[PDB]
Design a protein around this nucleic acid. Sequence first.
DNA 1: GACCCGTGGA
DNA 2: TCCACGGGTC
Length: 280
Amino acid sequence: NYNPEEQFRCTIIRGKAKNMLDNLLPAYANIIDDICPCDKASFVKDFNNRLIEILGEETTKKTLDNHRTEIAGKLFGMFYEDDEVIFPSGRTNKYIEDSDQPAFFKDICFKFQFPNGMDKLDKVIEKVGAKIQIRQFPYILQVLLTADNNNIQLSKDDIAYYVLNSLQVLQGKIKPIEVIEKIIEDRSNDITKKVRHPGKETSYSMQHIREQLNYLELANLIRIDGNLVKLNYREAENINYIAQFWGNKPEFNAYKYDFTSEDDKKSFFKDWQQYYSNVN
DNA sequence: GACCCGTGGA
DNA sequence: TCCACGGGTC
């Protein structure tokens, strides 16, 4: 039944901190820890004024704002808002205590899901309309385990086409063994599949897929070795613990919100941040 | 009257 | 090839 030909582009936020992460993650965390708790006006000012010291004086305000909202706020879940005040998140609070970068990204991978409240509303509505519901990192790990069970290695293009851009997989309808069987079948017929979009550049098609893999690698659970994606079995216990959730519905239920209600829209994004960034 | 993603330096 | 600036488009 599994048909990967049903393709669906499903993004995550585009990164800004990979190259300089070892400097930027402490900066984000220390800025937030230092200036919070504070009101939103003070947060916006003081965060940008601190970050520009790190990124460089030519950095535009728009870039500073985008770091704050897209990466420190949404993708890395490092602060949240409650009662007009901005606070350091539980994830930040932990990192401030232990400086454990792999654990930071393991938590991100554990909690990530589609749909989520990182996306713009029109994209959320698109993903909900497509009945997307997946914990993608548990799923990827089980797919990699199953590939190893079967003595094959998967490429980034395999993960892209058959998992992270496959509608049926993103819908939570497919078992990892079905994916591996299909990949083995296509290979035997000399079929190599890649994600393609007409007239679009490779970043459009693949950057969010490569960057999802980057965060799994920063969590120390995989290695991207050239074209191939390989488990790090020095973390076999963690790999198996997280993989167990491959078939679980997302912990955060996007489907109980009425996105025509202004109150439910507000609740949705707030509730998402609480789930993703804090301890529950 | 803030994520998305074209675009190009690294 | 990788990935992030900053303009593009609740």
